[PDB]
Design a binder for this molecule. Structure first.
Ligand SMILES: C[S@@+](CC[C@H](N)C(=O)[O-])C[C@H]1O[C@@H](n2cnc3c(N)ncnc32)[C@H](O)[C@@H]1O
Ligand SMILES: O=[N+]([O-])c1cc(O)c(O)c([N+](=O)[O-])c1
Ligand SMILES: [Cl-]
Ligand SMILES: [Mg+2]
Length: 214
């Protein structure tokens, strides 16, 4: 992950220590202009922000951390005592994520777990003291969105009103997830049309609110 280290080094050299906004701006400018990277980004980040502002989650699970952009972005909006648990399968990306979170001033809100989402999710109650989740941000490999959604449900981690928010439902796309949550009476869905981070290709997020196993 040479590019990812470069992004981190750019942030460490140019952003302001302890300042989450400064970190996000440094990443977004670097990535838009110099080296594209799969961060949720600023435009779609504003939709993520709005969802968190509307629903005010205190326990938030992120699937897929990468360099920590979205962890920093979401953590900046959370109340005291809130927990953002973020799961990242790649140890080198997790290491960057932790540096990024520490530098941004938000480490006290974030718990990073190195591992595959499908291994970690069944451990969240017993090993991470989770009860249920208020919100989940899905932004890992898209072929995991549907299986992890069903796993979350099976493991008893969703309550009525738990908000799923999925990135990239149009590009690269998550068609099997979308078909499921839209067609299922167990999820109330809203689609937010936007763009591929840093670019003009159309993309979107799906917000799917769990309605219980009905
Ligand atoms: C799109 S990047 C996440 C971007 C991040 N949410 C952001 O906006 O800054 C996707 C990440 O998912 C991770 N990933 C892929 N499969 C995963 C899995 N099964 N469990 C956890 N992380 C996984 C990849 O290593 C990669 O870092
Ligand atoms: O290829 N891409 O444009 C992306 C974009 C993204 O925002 C991703 O999250 C992604 N992925 O997780 O594979 C891929
Ligand atoms: Cl953007
Ligand atoms: Mg994405």
């Amino acid at each position: 992950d040479t590019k990812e280290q470069r992004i981190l080094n750019h942030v460490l050299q140019h952003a302001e220590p302890g300042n989450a906004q400064s970190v996000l701006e440094a990443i977004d400018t670097y990535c838009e202009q110099k080296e594209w990277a799969m961060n949720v980004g600023d435009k779609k980040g504003k939709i993520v922000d709005a969802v968190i502002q509307e629903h005010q989650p205190s326990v938030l699970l992120e699937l897929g951390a990468y360099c920590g952009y979205s962890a920093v972005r979401m953590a900046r909006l959370l109340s005291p005592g809130a927990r953002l648990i973020t799961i990242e399968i790649n140890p080198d990306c997790a290491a960057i994520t932790q540096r990024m979170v520490d530098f941004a001033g938000v480490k006290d809100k974030v718990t990073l777990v190195v591992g595959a989402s499908q291994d970690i999710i069944p451990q969240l109650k017993k090993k991470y003291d989770v009860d249920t989740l208020d919100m989940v941000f899905l932004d890992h490999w898209k072929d995991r969105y549907l299986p992890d959604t069903l796993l979350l449900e099976e493991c008893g981690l969703l309550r009525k009103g738990t908000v799923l928010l999925a990135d990239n439902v149009i590009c690269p796309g998550a068609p099997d997830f979308l078909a499921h949550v839209r067609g299922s009476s167990c999820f109330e869905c809203t689609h937010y049309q936007s763009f591929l981070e840093y670019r003009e290709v159309v993309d979107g997020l799906e917000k799917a609110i769990y309605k219980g196993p009905g």
